């Protein structure tokens, strides 16, 4: 059973710097793909980052092309996301899965992590 444990936090000032983390267990992390997917209440899927197995390719969206950069820690199974220079339009719940945006996902989304950028 694949277990996805999201972490991080919200309630930050506009333009701050947050670091979201998501660890996993089960499947072999040394060769697989990871991607952060967020969704605001009212909207649907909206991907923000992508990374390959050997950290050779890193894809991002047009709205977050220069906001944050996804990394990989194949030694210790984790998934960091150093969010920098966020705005009020980035208030959504982020998720980690095994697909860039798609409609795919071969594991139940466990808990997620809500990030609030306001006031």
């Amino acid at each position: 059973e694949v277990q996805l444990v999201e972490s991080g936090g919200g309630l930050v000032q506009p333009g701050g710097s947050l670091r979201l983390s998501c660890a996993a267990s089960g499947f072999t992390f040394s060769s697989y793909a990871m991607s952060w997917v967020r969704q605001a209440p009212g909207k649907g899927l909206e991907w923000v980052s992508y990374i390959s197995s050997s950290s050779s390719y890193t894809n991002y969206a047009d709205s977050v092309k220069g906001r944050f950069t996804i990394s990989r820690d194949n030694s210790k199974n984790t998934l960091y996301l150093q969010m920098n220079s966020l705005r009020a339009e980035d208030t959504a719940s982020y998720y980690c899965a095994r697909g860039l945006a798609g409609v795919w996902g071969i594991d139940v989304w466990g808990q997620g992590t809500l990030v609030t950028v306001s006031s």
């Binding site: 499947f27 050779s56 390719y57 697909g99 996902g105 071969i106 139940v108 989304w109």
Partner: protein, 427 residues
């Protein structure tokens, strides 16, 4: 080890008819909570698979699921790998979305060396199969690689227009079908042709009205078009695109043979065990499945299979199991992928209903009998279009099928993709 297509000699599969359900439907499309749902609608799907790489396309409509609007059309390819233990999956790697969502309609995919061409039709009048009397005919093919790289700008997304068209007598061409095939260094796309009704050469004495007393003789001619008093009669075919010349974008529409000539419907040609197999939907007088292998690749000379147990439902005018000429343009797309050639064993998600569109059931049939069926959902969930593709997982056949069902806690027609393995031991 590797996820390849039907090549070599697979394991021995079930060859007998058993009521014991030995098929294990496995869902690989686990969606996230949609709490705060709206009037969304996902239609116009696409699922192609070749040598371990897939593709997907969908048009999300906010409101009605037929007469709706366009907001986003996610078209992306990816790789087909294992989730970790004997269960394949579709891992997407590249995603592309056009600027204006209400331009792209009726896409067609194909496989290549290290790319994935997506031939879509460009229209500024809406659905081309509904307002073809003013459509221009421009076609755009988008090339998306299955392995992106850093700072390529010419290796991840490259669009090109198909200027030169070799239309002989047809007035317009358009990619119509999920995907096609490749023959070494040549690309083939499923399509339908637009021909004038007054320029049709079909004697009204070859219509199969022998044991069809309740049918007029001119029903064959009136069924070749969307409406009786229309201005175009559809004609199936394929689009040839040899990407080895590259002197100019060429379009070669080769019409289908006259054997069991029906109205234009989404075609699907695919390679199975070396020989290319062709499929054609049934949106005409013929309600049965049009199956058969291709012997002459170019002129679409296909030996049609006379199956009498697998069909598609419809409306009151032309319901299921109605093999007589009648003026009607209705039906549902339900394909099947060939898994064996010695015994001609096929497999696909076909609906089981008389005049409705519910109860999507995966069924396996050789030519005239059902071997073993399995219900992917309850007997009340609706389903419109299904796309079935089969492959191998390192020793054995595996089939992933995209079936649009009605999820309970979604209230929207969701294209759920199941994973069914052809078993090697049955009762």
């Amino acid at each position: 080890e590797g996820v390849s297509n039907l090549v070599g000699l697979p394991n021995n599969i079930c060859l007998q008819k058993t009521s014991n359900q030995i098929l294990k439907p496995k869902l690989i499309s686990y969606t996230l909570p949609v709490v705060g749902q709206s009037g969304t609608c996902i239609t116009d799907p696409l699922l192609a698979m070749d040598e371990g790489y897939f593709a997907y396309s969908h048009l999300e409509k906010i409101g009605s699921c037929s007469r709706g609007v366009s907001k986003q059309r996610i078209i992306g390819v990816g790789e087909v790998l294992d989730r970790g233990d004997e269960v394949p999956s579709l891992f997407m790697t590249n995603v592309w979305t056009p600027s204006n969502p209400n331009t792209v309609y009726h896409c067609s995919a194909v496989y290549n060396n290290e790319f994935y061409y997506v031939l879509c039709a460009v229209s500024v009048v809406g659905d081309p199969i509904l307002n073809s009397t003013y459509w221009s005919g421009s076609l755009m093919m988008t090339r998306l690689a299955v392995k992106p790289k850093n700072n390529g700008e010419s290796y991840n997304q490259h669009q090109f227009a198909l200027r030169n068209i070799e239309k002989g007598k047809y007035d317009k061409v358009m990619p119509y079908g999920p995907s096609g095939i490749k023959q070494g260094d040549t690309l083939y796309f499923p399509a339908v042709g637009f021909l004038v009704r007054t320029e049709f050469t079909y004697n009204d004495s070859n219509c199969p009205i022998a044991e069809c007393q309740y049918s007029k003789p001119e029903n064959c001619r009136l069924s070749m078009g969307i409406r009786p008093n229309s201005h175009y009669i559809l004609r199936s075919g394929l689009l040839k695109y040899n990407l080895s010349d590259e002197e100019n974008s060429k379009i070669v529409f080769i019409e289908i043979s006259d054997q069991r000539l029906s109205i234009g419907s989404p075609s699907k040609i695919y390679d199975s065990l070396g020989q290319p197999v062709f499929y054609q939907a049934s949106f005409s007088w013929d309600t049965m499945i049009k199956f058969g292998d291709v012997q002459t690749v170019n002129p679409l000379v296909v030996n049609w299979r006379d199956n009498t147990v697998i069909s598609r439902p419809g409306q009151s005018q032309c319901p299921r199991f109605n093999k007589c000429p009648e003026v009607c343009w209705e039906g549902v797309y339900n394909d099947a992928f060939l898994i064996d050639r010695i015994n001609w064993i096929s497999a696909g998600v076909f609906l089981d209903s008389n005049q409705t569109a519910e109860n999507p059931v995966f069924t396996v049939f050789k030519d005239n009998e059902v071997l073993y069926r399995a219900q992917l959902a309850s007997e009340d969930t609706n389903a419109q279009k299904t796309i079935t593709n089969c492959f191998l997982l390192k020793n054995k056949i595996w089939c992933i099928s995209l079936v649009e069902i009605y999820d309970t806690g979604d209230n929207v027609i969701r294209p759920k993709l199941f994973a069914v393995k052809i078993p090697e031991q049955c009762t």
